[PDB]
User: Fold Probable uracil phosphoribosyltransferase from Sulfolobus solfataricus.
Amino acid sequence: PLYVIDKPITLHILTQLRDKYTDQINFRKNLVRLGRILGYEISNTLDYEIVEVETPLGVKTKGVDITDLNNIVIINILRAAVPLVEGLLKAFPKARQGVIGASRVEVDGKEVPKDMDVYIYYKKIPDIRAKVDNVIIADPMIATASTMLKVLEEVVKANPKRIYIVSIISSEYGVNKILSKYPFIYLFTVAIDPELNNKGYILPGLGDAGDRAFG
Amino acid sequence: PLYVIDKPITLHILTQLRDKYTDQINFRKNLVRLGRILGYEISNTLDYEIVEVETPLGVKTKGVDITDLNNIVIINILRAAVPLVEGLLKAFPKARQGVIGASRVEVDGKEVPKDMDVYIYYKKIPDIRAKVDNVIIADPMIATASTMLKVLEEVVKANPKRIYIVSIISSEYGVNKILSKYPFIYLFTVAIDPELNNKGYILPGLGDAGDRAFG
Amino acid sequence: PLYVIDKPITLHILTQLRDKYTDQINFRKNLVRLGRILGYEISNTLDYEIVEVETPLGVKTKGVDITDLNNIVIINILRAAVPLVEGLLKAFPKARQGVIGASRVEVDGKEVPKDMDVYIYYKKIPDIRAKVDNVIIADPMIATASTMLKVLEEVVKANPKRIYIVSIISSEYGVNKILSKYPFIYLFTVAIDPELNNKGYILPGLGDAGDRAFG
Amino acid sequence: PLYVIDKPITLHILTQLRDKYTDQINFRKNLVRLGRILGYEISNTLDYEIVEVETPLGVKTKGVDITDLNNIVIINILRAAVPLVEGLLKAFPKARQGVIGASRVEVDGKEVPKDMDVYIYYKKIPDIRAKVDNVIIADPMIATASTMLKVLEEVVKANPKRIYIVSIISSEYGVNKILSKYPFIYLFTVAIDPELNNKGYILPGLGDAGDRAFG
Ligand SMILES: Nc1ccn([C@@H]2O[C@H](COP(=O)(O)OP(=O)(O)OP(=O)(O)O)[C@@H](O)[C@H]2O)c(=O)n1
Ligand SMILES: Nc1ccn([C@@H]2O[C@H](COP(=O)(O)OP(=O)(O)OP(=O)(O)O)[C@@H](O)[C@H]2O)c(=O)n1
Ligand SMILES: Nc1ccn([C@@H]2O[C@H](COP(=O)(O)OP(=O)(O)OP(=O)(O)O)[C@@H](O)[C@H]2O)c(=O)n1
Ligand SMILES: Nc1ccn([C@@H]2O[C@H](COP(=O)(O)OP(=O)(O)OP(=O)(O)O)[C@@H](O)[C@H]2O)c(=O)n1
Ligand SMILES: O=c1ccn([C@@H]2O[C@H](COP(=O)(O)O)[C@@H](O)[C@H]2O)c(=O)[nH]1
Ligand SMILES: O=c1ccn([C@@H]2O[C@H](COP(=O)(O)O)[C@@H](O)[C@H]2O)c(=O)[nH]1
Ligand SMILES: O=c1ccn([C@@H]2O[C@H](COP(=O)(O)O)[C@@H](O)[C@H]2O)c(=O)[nH]1
Ligand SMILES: O=c1ccn([C@@H]2O[C@H](COP(=O)(O)O)[C@@H](O)[C@H]2O)c(=O)[nH]1
Assistant:
């Protein structure tokens, strides 16, 4: 499943993120704000149950209960993902969090890269209950999808109920590379940009997330 | 314009609010959470302009800018509205806030009320720039719409660019009474309940907002 | 007990509040920020129990547990108090909240007022468990103390374990009027100003809280 | 300068952190809450200036202005530091943030370690304006101080106005190793534990921060 959340407000925020004239502080704040929104969006795709509920007026009426809100595990790739994850956590108060610090190797090639090398420097995750937990992996940018793939390479092992991916911008290349390998993934993104350059950056994109957030 | 935000997450929260077994603390927390969501929702209906922006990659791309995010005035009816307004404020960081403390007189009549008598005990509002400001009036419950009408009775005077009304539950009666008197209002609500009782309470509803929040 | 929290940060914020050139938005934001801080401050005066706990290293060590953090009731006077209460609530996550909407009558007299007439327009409070609950009443300004006294006039009825009063600025007159009538009250304030004018305003003070927040 | 913030509330939170029976969610939440508090505490040690301002009552009074609140750079060591940094950021709204991902090598030795080997896997920091910026480095635990030292090894290069270190628990050994090498550092901690074990863990301590937060 591919979800492109292009509502006014998310595009508005995305514009600010794209704007090279946005300082790191506001860059991060916007990233958190988006995380919260994308969380809301994911919420409505979550599996839920119909229930009945009684009101103070002594009458019963039917309602909804997204019990799955207790079966969420957010994976923090770290670095630029932090502010985004922060937003997601605010969205899912009862979510557990694990971290899989992965970093692709920045390299300048002759052609547009198809894959980068990614390494997991730190891993500490909660226990992902197979068939029960909804796992959400966040990463502001998905270029060659190499980073996401490395993380997924082992989130899938746990066989979660669902696996959501959340990013601000994903390249057409990355999106296809991921969904063709794991068609069951719910991929959420604010925008899908057309191309990558020789260094592996999304165009137009918004520059290097890490630098835009901490530089 | 009538907007009934019945997405899973808002219904989920509404269910918790309806549930007579929800303590005041969680009642309020849920009210704030909804406020933020409804804010997000309103955001996407806001008037916006298309712009262009240059990304760090030295390329220009078009984007959105909801400049109107600077022309928002939230009116706090006070009492139960507080938690809801709190949520709205978190949604509109740059919003100004005024307060019009209005309270209908709780009375027990023979038939289902069509109007209650509301009085403004405190009024202090910013400068509502005609044709420019988007005014948002919040009230968890709209039963006879008498309360909303009293407030509107003078928000309209300022002739804002737009006037949004936000509630958790509104009675079919209230919604009709408001939109037929001010067809231009953007009325947002999570649910529209069918009837009112002799005391003027929404059925099923969720009881007395004030009591559910501070009792 | 009188507590004047005059640490750099609280004075810094108080300065912003005093400055007449501070818009309502930042006025309110600062009020919330102070509420948090004052909450923290009150926390450390709270009654607590020494306990023992076992760390992951399989060793036991003594610790503290402010169980009273579950026995807090914050009373919202409404209007300008809202932002301050918001800050307090963020400080006491598990606090219940009641509201006693009281408003003194603004009048211009020949001399400096010694009392104003305050009326309770709305009252809805949780159950204040005598000898157990720590009640916190917030009001940004305490001039003739007439407002605080009216509220206390019945918070005392419930015979709480403790009663804390929180304000940004209190007049020397008010502070003495309160603590001499209820010596057991824990009165917290960022600053105590010297005099009141003929209309009953604190000098230097910071103007009318309501107007500075919603005007 | 050594600052041991042992007020009721910080000890209360520290107790929860120490308790091995605290799940990762509440572990993290407490870490953020402390970050805020410790931020508040640091705030009051900040350099400030005395100013004057005119209140709405047309009178001038002196006030404080901690201008340095604009000259703060928080360094995120990543991993367990994240929640702590999150708290600090909430305390310093205008703070810039850089990250120096450093990780000591966990090893089991015969005796109590005196140093571990730490490596910097990722570094991206803002402009640390010499003599002007107040740098705050956060790390929940300081055992052999090897991690802090590695980070400081190059924060010092920038010659900031001040350098604050923030941790929940620091070993007597670490505290001594740091302050004797950089006597000018403002070291803030909630508690100083007596010893380390053969693996380099603080006793009593609270276990492995990373595991307590993401395990
Ligand atoms: N120097 C700063 C200041 C803030 N932040 C991030 O921005 C968030 C909140 O910004 P603000 O708009 O002041 O808070 P609200 O969104 O209005 O409320 P909340 O923090 O609960 O979302 C912080 O939590 C943090 O994640 C940051 O990265 N760097
Ligand atoms: N599953 C979760 C839920 C929350 N958090 C952390 O705990 C913080 C807030 O917890 P809550 O008490 O719900 O928010 P408040 O402290 O009351 O307000 P604020 O978030 O602005 O501090 C989040 O921002 C986040 O840093 C987390 O790590 N994991
Ligand atoms: N006893 C309490 C505690 C909280 N609240 C309300 O609930 C809000 C936040 O609850 P929490 O989930 O701890 O904060 P987050 O939603 O996670 O982050 P934020 O406060 O910025 O929304 C408070 O701001 C306040 O409006 C309340 O009315 N009464
Ligand atoms: N137009 C606005 C915007 C904000 N606020 C108040 O200021 C608070 C938060 O301001 P911000 O600094 O953006 O949030 P943080 O303090 O950083 O995090 P938190 O909201 O949980 O305290 C809101 O919750 C609200 O009480 C307000 O009264 N009017
Ligand atoms: O334009 C880009 C492309 C990638 N990245 C970063 O590089 C990593 C590589 O993603 P990928 O190319 O492996 O998909 C991601 O963590 C992301 O933060 C950017 O900051 N900007
Ligand atoms: O079922 C109801 C109906 C109304 N009200 C409260 O009574 C007021 C009256 O609204 P109205 O009947 O004038 O529309 C509103 O402020 C609202 O909070 C409730 O709490 N519950
Ligand atoms: O300088 C002042 C004095 C009072 N008040 C407001 O007037 C009320 C009266 O307090 P008191 O004079 O009864 O103590 C309080 O709610 C307070 O908000 C102000 O806003 N500014
Ligand atoms: O009891 C301990 C000791 C250390 N650490 C972690 O190990 C690192 C090493 O600190 P140090 O021993 O180099 O001072 C720190 O990042 C810290 O998070 C813990 O989690 N618990």
DSSP finds six helices and twelve strands in chain C. Chain C has one domain: 1-215. Residues A 25, 28-29, 32, 83, 86, 90; B 90, 93; D 86, 89-90, 93, 95, 97 surround cytidine-5'-triphosphate (ligand 1) (CB under 6 Å). The two ends of chain C are 34 Å apart (CA to CA).
